[PDB]
Structure 1
């Protein structure tokens, strides 16, 4: 609970806790628990917000998204998940929540848990809110979250700029009328489709019939508003802009940053930005536009102009009349100019590229299906019925090859990872790379060029070491791997666990594009509670008894 957080002093939170506190190591002891119950149901012939009826959706508590989780910094969040789907298992992953020494609550089926079985299976997740900001949750059962198993997280805390009004969450997502498993099957042998629409806070107008509604945000004239923008898509990467207004970034993913004013923002799949908008212009209706850059390399929509309305209170109703001007083309790249308020410093001069720190991503066209994504030679394929944690608990280290285990034994040390984007393959695409368990430092990447330009880079210390930044670089949980290029990340091994590191485009992680960092496994078994072990085994027993009765095969990685 805050005691000094006010509009003119958002930096303050409570005694001992403010925007400069190192939240990764110091957490308020609030003693409070915020609990939720998620009931997952399978609904056929569901009428969506743009008027089109979808063949099948998978909903939390009967709505297009699950409830907005809300707690304070230092609370515990507890979610009972009850799976009333017909056939699918489910696992809910709390994206952006590092699960420090709570790996078994990460929701990564086949890694940290077996899936909760359908027809009434249940599990309760419990995690500490050791960060504040905007995050989200979604299924990790193959591409299930593309059917509706998704929602937002708002953990309140201090901020890097004063503001008057917290407008809350503003999730933006691609929207397909086809169901997720159908799209996974499709994308195994075909380029992915443009989205049928882009929803903004759950709604959009159908570009074809005019049904639906624009999201409508009311601004209080003369006031400073925090807007928590998310990209919860399965594939689309968005540019956002508000006509005639700038946006001031105060957080990137769940990491507060020094204020940074921009005219438009690029959000990768899974990224968030907290921004402050000053209602400083003439009272009117303004469009908030979603646009695409990068010559389609990171998505498009068949709605040519997805948008929301920002309405100044007291102004007329109606649609905005100024179409504004297109934002700069971000070329499928997030900005590396953000700077965390709580800094990190690491050396970059000593980096040496070696097989054991290099993750080559490659598209393999030579087998079945046609599009298979491999990392270091292997497409990931997890066993929902024998998760990596089961190996840890039984002392078996014979991990299957397709689990893509990258064992990291270093204890609370910075580890450096060079990811290479198929520079030798016939073509390469942008990928939004996401790490569970940690925020990474973005130490650098290949030179920024047009996403569709086919220019290729391989890391060369002679020119690239000097392009690296270890002086408080961007710190976040998702960033872009440039098409044709490379990306150098670092993270500190402060959290024993099995942690996925994967592309967040559903079609690609389905297709194999992940590894699993097995961090300090010799420390992990000691740190697993009896309750967590017992409940892991309970759910896996139920899952393993269920699975042979399932009528459908698993057709992808499981993730």
Structure 2
């Protein structure tokens, strides 16, 4: 039973300069929103068709005025999208927002830079784009979010994020809760700051070192409760915050068992009383409420702040038990002739950088052949006290081999796409790209992302000549935004610009 957070306590966000503590809202407690499942336009055993529509609207979050929000196929966040390993997936990306966006499938092993939906995949106002892909990767929880470069931070803040569930045959065979919305629920962890008339104001809250508001928002709900009607419940934790770290535990120190990470089931279940998640990380846990009587309640906390109340209703006894082993991890081979790649994250605030530079949308920072796993050493250069930087790579699911030459954390033996790197620490990852393209790698503190803590790698088939890709440029991006907002390029405000400008550089 893991009873403490794994990360280095001195580097926790709560020691940040200008740390924003969470405060319990006075808003009335209400049922946790569970995003509906997006209904396919059509579906067979072999093909599924979806239309995913970015849209602007309004959402009742606090008593009083509705908060203006953005969402996918709804006003805030999104309907949950289900993908299936081996199923040919066809998606119409529709943008009905007043500004351009991008549709990034975080953790999905798809081609880049277009299907990947990163910096180079704009979808302009009024436009529809079509993509198709077949996922060949294990069952897991992924997510969809906006990824214009910039500002990913602003678009996520507005509400553009949705859970993506990947199903496969192996997971389906297992005794896990799986009744979506009944005993299997998203827990998208975010925070916001509400201004006058219950509005969000990213610009007013902007901080190049990471934006955090004092009001926790879970699945777009303030002060939620969940009605438990089964002994066991599956929680799909997703850290969807711009910066905040979640340090999760129950009252009574009720234990819970992690069965999944970002990219796969864990090889074996891992039991915990206290679990920490950095930005973009996912943890699927099973909670067993068998020791509670009907009518009782149990609250989930982050640090000393209540997040989510579980109300215990009558439930049937559950006699099932987790197998000793959930999933077999097959590590790809590493060609000994390959170098160990060294990636160095540095800086904070406006001076964030990777390998001595801020992102430049037309600069390739690295290449790697497809189909060849390589060791990546990833270092967080910050001296103590520092912050934990969650490092993320597009177009892959990696394995974690070591932290400072020692074992990874107990819940890091499955496939992952995002890893918290502590000040002074070097983590060794095993990284392979199955598909050619251009893929970002960056910190997932989203203000750091926007502020230039990002690079891109061109993965290539060595049997073919170098491919040419149409990369977005910053002049094109700013022209578009200018037209869209009815202003001149020079008066455009974007999250991340301040970091570039203050360091005298440009994207």
Do the two structures share a fold, i.e. TM-score over 0.5? yes
Distance 1:468 1:433 in 2: 15
Query: What is the correspondence of 1:10-159 to structure 2 with a 5 Å cutoff?
Result: 30-41=45-56, 43=57, 46=58, 48-51=60-63, 53=65, 56-86=68-98, 88-99=99-110, 101=111, 103-110=113-120, 113=121, 115-118=122-125, 120-131=126-137, 132-141=139-148, 142=151, 143=153, 144-157=155-168, 158-159=170-171
Residue 182 (structure 1) aligned with residue 191 (structure 2): no
Do the aligned partners of residues 128 and 263 (structure 1) sit closer, same or farther apart at CA in structure 2, a change above 3 Å counting? same
Q: CA contact under 8 A between 2:380 and 2:423: conserved in structure 1?
A: yes
Q: In the TM superposition, what is the alpha-carbon distance from 1:432 to its structure 2 partner?
A: 0.8
Give the drift of 1:523.
Answer: 6.2
Structure 2: 5+ residue stretches without partners: 1-43, 316-323, 498-505
Partner SS for 1:282: coil
Task: Work out the CA distance in 2 between the residues paired with 1:35 and 1:121.
Answer: 16
- Once the two structures are TM-superposed, the CA of residue 524 in structure 1 deviates from its matched residue by 7.8
How far off its partner does 1:232 sit? Answer: 1.5
Distance in structure 2 (CA, Å) of the matches to 1:411 and 1:164? 36
Decide whether aligned partners of structure 1 residues 133 and 435 sit closer, same or farther in structure 2, where only a CA change above 3 A counts: same
Correspondence list, 1:248-259, <5 A: 248-257=257-266, 258-259=268-269
Change (3 A) 1:548 1:182: closer
Q: Is contact 1:430-1:482 (8 Å) kept? A: yes
276 and 467 in structure 1: CA distance in 2 versus 1, 3 angstrom threshold: closer
Q: Against the structure 1 CA distance between its residues 525 and 76, is the aligned structure 2 distance closer, same or farther, given a 3 Å change threshold?
A: farther
Q: Which residue of 1 aligns with 2:240?
A: 232
Where does structure 1 lack aligned partners over 5 or more consecutive residues? 1-28, 206-213, 293-303, 316-337, 365-369, 383-399, 447-463
CA distance in 2, matches of 1:134, 1:524: 34
Q: What is the distance in 2 between the residues matched to 1:479 and 1:266?
A: 12
Question: What corresponds to 1:501 in structure 2?
Answer: 441
- 1:59 deviation in Å? 2.8
Alignment TM-score, normalising by the size of structure 1: 0.66
SS where residue 146 of structure 1 aligns? helix
Alpha-carbon distance in structure 1 between the residues aligned to 2:395 and 2:207 = 28
- Is the Cα–Cα contact under 8 Å of residues 50 and 203 in structure 1 kept in the other structure? no
Partners of 1:345 and 1:203 in 2: how far apart? 39
C-alpha distance in 2 between matches for 1:201 and 1:55: 15
Cα shift at 1:135 = 1.2
* Secondary structure in 2 matching 1:182: helix
**In structure 1, what is the Cα distance between the partners aligned to 2:408 and 2:165?**
32
CA shift at 1:545, angstroms?
8.0
Structure-2 residue corresponding to 1:414 = 373
Work out the CA distance in 1 between the residues paired with 2:434 and 2:390.
23
Given that 1:48 and 1:54 are in contact with CA atoms closer than 8 Å, whether structure 2 keeps it comes out as: yes
Shift of 1:436: 1.0
Preserved contact between residue 78 and residue 125 of structure 1 (Cα < 8 Å): yes
Q: SS at 2:156's partner residue?
A: helix
Contact preservation (8 Å) 1:497, 1:521: no
Deviates more, 1:501-510 or 1:518-527: 518-527
Quote the Cα distance in structure 1 between the aligned partners of 2:413 and 2:247: 22
Secondary structure of the structure 1 residue equivalent to 2:157: helix
| Pairing 1:277-316 to 2, within 5 Å after superposition | 277-283=287-293, 284-292=295-303, 305-314=305-314
User: Residues 329-358 of structure 1, C-alpha deviation per residue, up to 9 Å, x if partnerless?
Assistant: xxxxxxxxx998222447899899x8x722
Alignment-derived partner of residue 456 in structure 1: none
From 422, 425, 428, the counterpart of 1:485: 425
1:304-347, Cα deviation, whole Å (9 max, x unpaired): 624212222239xxxxxxxxxxxxxxxxxxxxxx9982224478
Does the 8 A contact of 1:173 with 1:198 survive in 2? yes
Deviation at 1:526, TM superposition (A): 8.9
The whole-number CA distance in structure 1 between the counterparts of 2:242 and 2:445 is 5
SS state of the match for residue 254, structure 1? Answer: coil
Equivalence for 1:556? 496
Query: How many Å apart are 1:486 and its aligned residue?
Result: 2.3
CA 1:371/1:55 → structure 2, altered by over 3 Å: closer, same or farther?
A: farther
Indicate if the aligned counterparts of 1:340 and 1:474 stay in contact, CA closer than 8 A. no
- Is the contact between residue 143 and residue 161 of structure 2 (CA under 8 Å) also seen in structure 1? yes
Q: Which residue pairs with 2:395 in the alignment? A: 437
Q: Deviations over 1:419-451 (max 9, x none)?
A: 22224x6863111111111111112223xxxxx
Q: CA deviation at 1:165?
A: 4.7
TM-score, normalising length: structure 2:
0.72
Match of 1:381, SS state, is coil
> Which residue is 1:274 aligned to?
284
Contact 2:59–2:68 (CA under 8 A) maintained in structure 1: no
Q: CA deviation at 1:493?
A: 3.5
Q: Distance in 1 between matches of 2:460 and 2:471?
A: 22
Once residues 429 and 526 of structure 1 are traced to their aligned partners in structure 2, the CA distance between those partners, rounded to angstroms, is 38
Three-state SS of the structure 1 residue aligned to 2:402 is: strand
